[PDB]
């Protein structure tokens, strides 16, 4: 799985995700990646999110939309909503993974509960940041 | 405050089993893609066009499990999925289970823009794309040695 | 605590002008029978998960409703069926989409839920998983009804 | 589309949905019905929901989960969450349809913004109610 989220100069959010699924997957399995609200979500009112990890858990937890709803309805910060979903709710269902998120104020979060997540980010006009490990 | 973030997958990445030069191939690929998105944002390109292009580049890069470099299924086939969502209109497009589309994220965007639907699957998704001039690719253009060896190891 | 069921057979443009009381009564009688089966099962201590599975199986079997037997026709005069089920206790779910050879999609969804590590399967892969777990293969012709075929015809031109 | 929601004597919620889609649909289209959070959702903490109507809008608005999140995070009653989603948010996106919902306290709601919705409900031990029109 791969993904991207962005906030543009006009204040618009967008998200995308693409994958091959899991090595040795049972043919016909659909994970959260092509599912709006599970693998991918964007709403200018709140956040743009793209997810990666244990597919069935991100569907059950509606992880991408849950970030949005925790912020919009719960009043959580982006960082608190990410901590809640990735470090608490996903492991409680037996899930491993992470996500990338940008809110409408341009806060960015790249939470993950795995050993690694290939990731990078950067503000327009600035040097990018990259990572693999924790 | 325009900004991009990308990812190339979360999971068990082991540093004992990695050289710095191997890691740097991933870092260099991520850095190049984020820089392309940053330059598009600075130029006034839309968030939707930026995430589409970033994901298209991650698909093209064989290092990442999307598009070229997709993992293998139990049957040594590829089944690809993608989604894209516009936070301004709340429109979205998605494809699941496609094997003959080089760039699933572009097919997802085609569903969003050229149909009233959000999600299409399998051969029906492919036929929708092909009927709209998207190219049919050989199903095997995604295959790489590294992902085939990981398949062999997953079985063992 | 107070157990309860609700069911639906679809939302859309129903007008009184279009309907006879006998037509309406076929729907009322079917809905009443299915909710009464659900109520009786709840009263007897059956799980919410088993009750919604059985109710939806009955709505599938009922040709009046667009699910299972009585499914609408696609542009290609095919049937493509989908279903989902979710357990609020465990937050497990199962779903199938784009299946044509499974008599009761909700039962296939329950099989994904209960007999796999997955939530969703599609198309031939979903069918093959179900068949490997002993679910019967049917012809998609079993879903066809004159009422839904006539609705396809009224929506198109012939050639 | 058809569906069912229930609350059992043990306090457990469940939901299910099944469909043939739309007359004359393009083969390969998946509407909101098989999709967790769009057409079907259940969580003992909140609600069980089964939806029917404009496929694309129920996915974009993640209607079933939105009921749950409005209740759990927003503190809305079942009736308030149902009005918000079915009578305000879905029409704002051009969506037509309805849903059935039971919350963990045994409240039942059968909202719809269409001319009709084939529907029925009943408490265990009570007489059932049926409806077609408004
Ligand atoms: Cl890990
Ligand atoms: Cl930066
Ligand atoms: Cl690192
Ligand atoms: Cl209507
Ligand atoms: Cl009525
Ligand atoms: Na790739
Ligand atoms: Na039926």
Numbering used by the authors:
A (entry chain BBB), D (entry chain DDD): 179 to 312
B (entry chain AAA): 3 to 158
C (entry chain CCC): 2 to 160
Which statements did the authors publish about this structure?
l-Asparaginases hydrolyze l-asparagine to l-aspartic acid and ammonia. The prototypic class 2 enzyme is EcAIII from E. coli. EcAIII belongs to the Ntn-hydrolases, which are expressed as immature polypeptides that dimerize and then autocatalytically cleave themselves into α (∼20 kDa) and β (∼15 kDa) subunits to form the mature (αβ)2 heterotetramer (a dimer of two αβ heterodimers). The same Thr179 acts as the nucleophile in the autoproteolytic maturation and in l-asparagine hydrolysis.
As this is currently the highest resolution EcAIII structure deposited in the PDB, this variant will be discussed separately. High-quality electron-density maps allowed us to observed fine details, for example the environment of Thr179 and the octahedral coordination sphere of the Na+ ion in the stabilization loop. In mutant RDM1-18 the D211W substitution introduced a bulky Trp side chain into the immediate neighborhood of the Thr179 nucleophile. Nevertheless, this mutation did not affect autoprocessing. The side chain of Trp211 filled the available space between the threonine triad and the fragment built from residues 207–210 containing the S211P substitution. In chain B, disorder was detected in the active site, while in the corresponding region of subunit D two alternative conformations of Trp211 are visible. The double conformation of Trp211 is correlated with the behavior of the 230–236 fragment, for which two alternative conformations are also visible. Waters w3 and w4 are absent in variants with bulky side chains at position 211, such as Gln (RDM1-3) or Trp (RDM1-18). The observations collected in this list indicate that even small distortions of any element responsible for maintaining the fragile architecture of the autoproteolytic center can abolish or significantly impair the autocleavage process. As shown in Fig. 8(b), the mutations introduced in the autoprocessed RDM1 variants were not harmful to the sensitive apparatus, and even the large side chain of Trp211 in variant RDM1-18, located in the close proximity of the nucleophilic Thr179, did not perturb the autoprocessing.
